[PDB]
């Protein structure tokens, strides 16, 4: 196989983003102290791309992305790194390498005392 590079960008309107997100309660995750939440996003049949947006309250969080081919095979789309997504909205896109499941890693494992509040959206498009 061969993998396309992802595209990632930030945008300034964090309060608005969070308010919009908060109009749905299943779009808000609490990542415990020292814990890692994995969001599994299967590839849509009607789409060729994954799109993600996310933000946090008052503290950074590690974010990264893997692709699980459908024991299994994993490719590293985005490396896990701490992002200041408490200050800006973080977002990105990746072209489907094929049929499979995307793994969004929200990684709080380095945080002893602080939970993290994660606001996120995932999309597909052609």
């Amino acid at each position: 196989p061969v993998i396309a590079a992802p595209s990632m960008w930030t945008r300034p309107q964090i309060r608005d983003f969070k308010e919009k997100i908060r109009q749905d309660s299943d779009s808000v995750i609490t990542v415990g102290r020292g814990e890692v939440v994995t969001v599994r996003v299967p590839t849509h049949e009607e789409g060729s791309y994954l799109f993600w947006e996310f933000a946090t309250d008052n503290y950074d969080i590690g974010f990264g992305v893997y692709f699980e081919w459908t024991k299994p095979v994993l490719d590293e789309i985005v490396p896990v790194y701490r992002r200041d997504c408490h200050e800006e909205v973080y977002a990105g896109s990746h072209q489907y390498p094929g049929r499979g499941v995307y793994l969004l890693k929200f990684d709080n494992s380095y945080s002893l005392w602080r939970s993290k509040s994660v606001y996120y959206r995932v999309y597909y498009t052609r």
Partner: peptide, 28 residues
């Protein structure tokens, strides 16, 4: 170790508007 399953939603012209507004790139 928690694992959530999300079904992605079709990206819309509206969604895409906001996302693009005052966008700044990023590298890793």
């Amino acid at each position: 170790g928690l694992t959530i399953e999300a079904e992605p939603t079709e990206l819309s012209y509206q969604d895409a508007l906001e996302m693009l507004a005052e966008s700044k790139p990023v590298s890793t």
